[PDB]
């Protein structure tokens with residue numbers, strides 16, 4: 107299984123209500139604290155040696171909105187995710203040198219923060235489709251690693 | 253990437269020299285010792301409470317040859333693995349109730365035993381193409397799990 | 399390993415959410431069976447492997463009871479959870495990969511239920527601790 | 541945790557293979573790089589992330605040296621590998637998921653080199669041991 111209409115609906119609903127300005131920074135800043143290895147690519151963002159500094163860092167906040175919005179293209183092209191992301195995939199691989207396992211870690215953070223935002227509305231069926239969508243994107247982000 | 257001619261050649265090679273009678277039992281028996289939770293599905297096989305009993309179990313040995321011949325169909329159908337395995341997938345999910353994570357643990361043992369058998373000829377190159385192939389069969393085995 | 403800071407963090411959180419353990423338990427397990435249908439392999443003895451079945455409900459409170467135990471034996475999980483380890487190793491034979499799966503569902507549930515309390519800092523320590531629990535349960539397997 | 545049997549089994553094996561640690565280290569790092577190309581992300585500072593390149597041979601021997609240390613410090617890996625853990629945590633920022641990739645490559649290498657010594661019994665104990673090293677290495681991350 108690929109996409110059922112239900113899945114299509116849920117994804118569509120979640121993104122039409124996404125508050126990028128809230129979710130973004132929170133997801134990325136949560137990721138940097140819980141999986142500190144992820145800080146490997148934020149040299150120059152300023153001091154990230156403590157929880158509090160990370161939550162307040164404006165560069166983190168901004169980069170988080172950047173990453174979150176990076177999901178828009180997947181949403182718009184649900185039947186062509188691999189092709190769509192190929193370019194971002196090559197970038198992360200050859201210019202950034204990001205360990206694709208970090209892709210997965212961030213997605214988990216995205217899911218936890220979105221979950222805290224929708225509360226009860228983040229049902230088991232929503233969680234299912236959302237994770238399925240993130241897992242397809244993460245797959246695509248790591249295919250151009252050679 | 254899907255199959256390169258080189259990968260096709262390496263897989264065909266390994267299988268045409270496979271000693272099922274040897275690797276078979278060795279892989280399964282090694283799996284039951286190293287990842288003992290896989291003994292879950294073998295009540296009836298006799299006693300498996302220690303390493304020597306397992307190695308010596310004739311039921312284990314015969315099922316080891318069974319499962320290893322189980323990849324023959326994938327080898328003869330390299331471009332249609334998911335369709336080929338769907339049935340075996342249904343079997344393992346609905347009648348056997350086998351945790352699919354076990355498919356991955358047996359693969360590592362197949363890889364480790366064939367490696368001990370091929371020694372030096374079990375190059376990095378071979379390893380890669382053999383793992384790739386196994387990962388595709390494991391993927392196919394877990395696909396009918398609803 | 400858990401630091402003192404981790405220990406204080408888990409202890410303080412549990413102090414706060416512990417009362418809703420049964421709910422968390424049901425929620426979590428229900429998510430685990432929907433989002434990760436392969437874990438259903440372990441519950442084939444039940445006819446009602448469905449979100450919130452009386453079987454899920456009941457089991458959810460048994461599991462969260464083991465988490466309540468771990469919080470209280472938080473200084474020595476290995477010894478504290480021994481008996482749970484034997485059950486899982488010999489009698490259920492649960493692949494320990496499944497522990498990570500449920501843990502993730504528990505974090506999602508806590509998150510949905512107690513957003514103000516589940517900060518990034520509480521998150522690091524509870525994640526270190528669940529990992530802790532997973533390793534203690536795996537102790538008697540091999 | 542490693543039992544006495546495990547510790548004796550590792551010591552005995554290491555006693556036997558230890559002389560080829562450098563060959564093992566080159567072999568295992570070369571397989572990691574080819575079979576799991578995403579790990580190459582950590583070696584972007586070298587121009588030669590190719591199997592058996594000078595850099596790979598060299599590193600091969602430094603990694604297997606850390607395993608030699610772990611064997612000698614097998615009664616308290618956490619303490620034994622503390623400095624290696626901070627180097628990985630704060631300087632290299634290596635994702636602990638990779639330790640498991642490398643460990644699997646190590647077993648494949650030993651398996652091709654010492655077929656007769658790598659019994660199923662040795663395998664269980666070395667697997668427990670390498671998981672133990674992975675956990676030790678990850679101590680200081682968070």
Ligand code: HEM
Nearest residue numbers: 144145147172173176177194198202204208209212213247
């Ligand atoms: C769901 C996973 C992710 C997605 C969809 C994503 C998306 C993006 C996008 C669209 C850019 C575009 C910037 C450009 O065109 O220059 C970007 C840049 C970047 N991303 Fe990723 N990202 C993800 C995960 C990560 C993670 C986990 C890390 C670090 C651990 C990371 C590190 C970076 C860095 C360092 C940049 C460059 C920003 C700059 O130009 O300074 N990404 N990402």
Ligand code: HEM
Nearest residue numbers: 290293318319320322323340344348350354355358359389
């Ligand atoms: C590469 C992975 C595997 C392959 C290719 C595979 C293949 C097979 C095949 C082809 C059968 C056919 C039996 C029939 O048609 O009656 C079978 C049966 C069976 N397999 Fe799997 N298997 C795999 C992994 C496993 C694992 C990991 C387990 C348990 C952990 C398992 C447990 C069983 C059981 C219990 C049966 C029924 C045997 C009987 O009593 O007749 N298999 N397997």
Ligand code: HEM
Nearest residue numbers: 437440441457460461463464465482490492496497500531
């Ligand atoms: C946080 C990790 C876990 C904890 C603390 C835990 C705790 C427990 C406890 C305390 C019981 C026994 C109830 C009694 O006393 O009768 C139990 C039973 C059981 N657990 Fe675990 N468990 C955990 C993870 C899992 C996972 C991940 C699975 C499988 C996917 C699993 C499968 C089972 C099964 C099949 C039983 C028997 C249930 C029955 O038939 O009623 N457990 N668990």
Ligand code: HEM
Nearest residue numbers: 579582583599602603604606607624632634638639642673
């Ligand atoms: C068995 C587990 C491991 C052991 C025992 C180990 C050991 C070591 C040691 C002892 C050093 C440093 C020597 C020095 O320069 O002072 C080192 C450096 C390093 N390790 Fe680890 N390591 C392990 C796993 C990994 C993994 C899985 C990776 C990622 C693919 C990795 C990436 C690195 C890097 C990038 C360096 C610095 C090397 C250089 O710059 O030339 N390590 N490792």
